[PDB]
């Protein structure tokens, strides 16, 4: 009887959360932005083509200086790229070739990498010996690592395949904070501009807002019908966008506690693998399974550009911090810089 | 050529990195990548010990082939989110205990897992090697407790040489794409030396098949 009592109590709390979100819904984002100027056809050409991987590229990440980027592929290699002159700065041999994520530290000193070995490896780029070197192996998960992002040189947050995000300490090597509450396994995370909150999308069609200091789940966003594969904060930090396997991108909202737009089209039936905003937050970039990359303006759901040019699934995407470039990676073992 | 001296030396560093990447890739392309699967309480540890925390990789050489098995049974996550990483393996070794027919039951779970990996969208052209393991105490477990417990449609005798072939035909009938891939099958035990010779012959036929596809002969 106690299980049914708390069951009905949780139903009543979900009903009052739904009633609060319905009472806050006074006008949609389509009804307000019907008077702004629609953006033109965003024509973007392949400036650089980075061709050094020999297997499927699963993740990339930009540097803070908007010139260096790292990319992870399952040929067992992790390559630092000079995006201006197409030079390979470093080539990092991985102990486990089955990697699914990579991160570039905002100081530029470190590079993270992880995957199906349940280990976030931290690589030191700037040593006295001249070579790259693994500094720490953060081994505390039981599921596969799906995303990792540095807070600073000493703190990193990882999302894993065991319905659990974790906050690490690089110097000691243990989990400072464990973030639990998802029921499906978490596929991506995204830090806020002020490194105090992060969102995470899992395979239970829910995205949760996490507080890094206290370690609690603040808000929970349910609008999708399938597994959320990618997530990214808006540049304001008051919104984020998710990309799922139901061929839709959705713009959620932290203060309004519910979704705003759905970025969908009837000719699109494949899942989103990657999502990123522009520098202004006006454009919304999204990588697909039908080998393309589509660009919506975020203020109105209409597709304003197609970044076609890959021959397999666009698995990773990054808009740089200057907004000058978009690096798209794919399973055809090529990175492409778009502008 | 409008490059500085450090730019030219950085290009030389990048070209040396390119040479190392090409050498490592053409070394890695000479290796046989095997995906090791199986149901719960399988006897895969015995044949791994014969052939020798998410993926237990196992590198071993045999008759100038460099095999690398990837024991991924133990990755307790949603398999649909990471099974596309193994697109391009040479074969798949799938381990079934034959004595798990009485312990739905374990054998129907094995059939469901084999049907899930065999008809998967990422392994349409991948051959599957199938060790039907623990055949020794299966042969004495079928003394009492007949196969009607597991397969009630079975009407043959309670002997070993018919029931084992019936279980083999029930697993091989789960293949929907019978034209593209093959299902190699071996009755194995714990004390069985020839478990590496069978996977050697099976990947030899798979390499010959891929070479017939590559050389235009198919």
């Amino acid at each position, epitope marked *: 009887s106690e299980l049914d009592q708390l069951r009905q109590e949780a139903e009543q709390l979900k009903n009052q959360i739904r009633d609060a979100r319905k009472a806050c819904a006074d006008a949609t984002l389509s009804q307000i932005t019907n008077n702004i100027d629609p953006v033109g056809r965003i024509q973007m050409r392949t400036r650089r083509t980075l061709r050094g991987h020999l297997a499927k590229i699963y993740a990339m990440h930009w540097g803070t200086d908007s010139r*260096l980027l790292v990319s992870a592929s399952q040929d067992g290699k992790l390559i630092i790229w000079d995006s201006y002159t197409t*030079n390979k*700065v470093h080539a990092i041999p991985l102990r486990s070739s089955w990697v699914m994520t990579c991160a570039y530290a905002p100081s530029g000193n470190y590079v993270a990498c992880g995957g199906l070995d349940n280990i976030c490896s931290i690589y030191n780029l700037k040593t006295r010996e*001249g070579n790259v070197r693994v500094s720490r192996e953060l081994a505390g998960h039981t599921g596969y690592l799906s995303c990792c992002r540095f807070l600073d040189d000493n703190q990193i947050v990882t999302s894993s395949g065991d319905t659990t995000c974790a906050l690490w300490d690089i110097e000691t090597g243990q989990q400072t904070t464990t973030f639990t509450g998802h029921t499906g396994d978490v596929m991506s995370l995204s830090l806020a501009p002020d490194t105090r909150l992060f969102v995470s999308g899992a395979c239970d069609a829910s995205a949760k807002l996490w507080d890094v200091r206290e370690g609690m789940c603040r808000q929970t966003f349910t609008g999708h019908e399938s597994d959320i594969n990618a997530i990214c904060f808006f540049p304001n930090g008051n919104a984020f966008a998710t990309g799922s396997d139901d061929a839709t991108c959705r713009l959620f909202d932290l203060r309004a506690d519910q979704e705003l737009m759905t970025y969908s089209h009837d000719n699109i039936i494949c899942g989103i693998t990657s999502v990123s905003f522009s520098k202004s937050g006006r454009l919304l970039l999204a990588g697909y399974d039908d080998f393309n990359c589509n660009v919506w303006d975020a203020l109105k759901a209409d597709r304003a550009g197609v970044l076609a040019g890959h021959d397999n699934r666009v698995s990773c995407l990054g808009v740089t911090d200057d907004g000058m470039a978009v690096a798209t990676g794919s399973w055809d073992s090529f990175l492409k810089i778009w502008n | 050529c409008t490059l500085s*001296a*450090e730019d030219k*030396a950085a290009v030389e560093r990048s070209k*040396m990195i390119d040479r190392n990447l090409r050498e490592d890739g053409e070394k890695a392309a000479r290796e046989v990548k095997l995906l090791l699967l199986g149901a719960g309480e399988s006897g895969k540890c015995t044949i791994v010990k014969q052939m020798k925390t998410g993926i237990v990789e196992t590198h071993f050489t045999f008759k100038d082939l460099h095999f690398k098995m990837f024991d991924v049974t133990a990755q307790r996550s949603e398999r649909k989110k990471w099974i596309h990483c193994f697109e391009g393996v040479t074969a798949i070794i799938f381990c079934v205990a034959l004595s798990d027919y009485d312990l739905m039951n374990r054998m129907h779970a094995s059939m469901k897992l084999f049907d899930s990996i065999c008809n998967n969208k990422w392994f349409t052209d991948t051959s599957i090697i199938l060790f039907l393991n623990k055949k020794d105490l299966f042969e004495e477990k079928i003394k009492k407790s007949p196969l009607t417990i597991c397969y009630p449609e079975y009407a043959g005798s309670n002997t070993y040489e018919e029931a084992a072939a019936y279980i083999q035909c029930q697993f091989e009938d789960l293949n929907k794409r019978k034209d593209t891939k093959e299902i190699y099958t071996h009755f194995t035990c714990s004390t069985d030396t020839k478990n590496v010779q069978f996977v050697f012959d099976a990947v030899t036929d798979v390499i010959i098949k891929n070479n017939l596809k590559d050389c235009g002969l198919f």
Partner: single-chain antibody
Amino acid sequence: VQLVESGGGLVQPGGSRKLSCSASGFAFSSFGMHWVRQAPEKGLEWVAYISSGSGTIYYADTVKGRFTISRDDPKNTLFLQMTSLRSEDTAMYYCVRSIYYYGSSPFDFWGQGTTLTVSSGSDIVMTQATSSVPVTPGESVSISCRSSKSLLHSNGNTYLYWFLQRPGQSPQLLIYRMSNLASGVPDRFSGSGSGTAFTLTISRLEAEDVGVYYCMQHLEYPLTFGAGTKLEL
């Protein structure tokens, strides 16, 4: 990380001698290597360079066709084969490692160097006006230098390096571009400048940063140093 140069001694003029530098403590195979000499009363001048993997070998148009630089990758030594030693080759020969990628610090570690004693045009000219500057600690010292052509390359980088040679020690890298501070170097040192005119500024001094400063260009080969500025008292 260390570089021990060996060989040297008294050599009759017109003879031959091979110098070795056994590297220890770093990835030797991924570093370009330079030999840079220093006359017993004069400053520094570049001699030879071999790249990583021995792909590019440069000489100084004074030893070209006369010295031979070679490196060994498994055994970590660096060789400089010298034939036909004239009287203008008596110096202490320093070995210095140098990596080149985007954002790297070339010329960051210098060997201790060994002594060699012999018996009996289109380059860029570094020019430092002040030969000796007397100074007290706590002050701020602005040392200037100038070039022949503009060291600002078209890609934005300006290739002027600032070094420091303590009395009785090997030179040390201070500033590894026009304004980039090297590792292990305090925040007092600050490089600046533009075009063909550059200035290293010391905000406040200590006792250990006295000695001779040298400026080097890395825009074009051959690499040319300046007549160094001495700081005493």
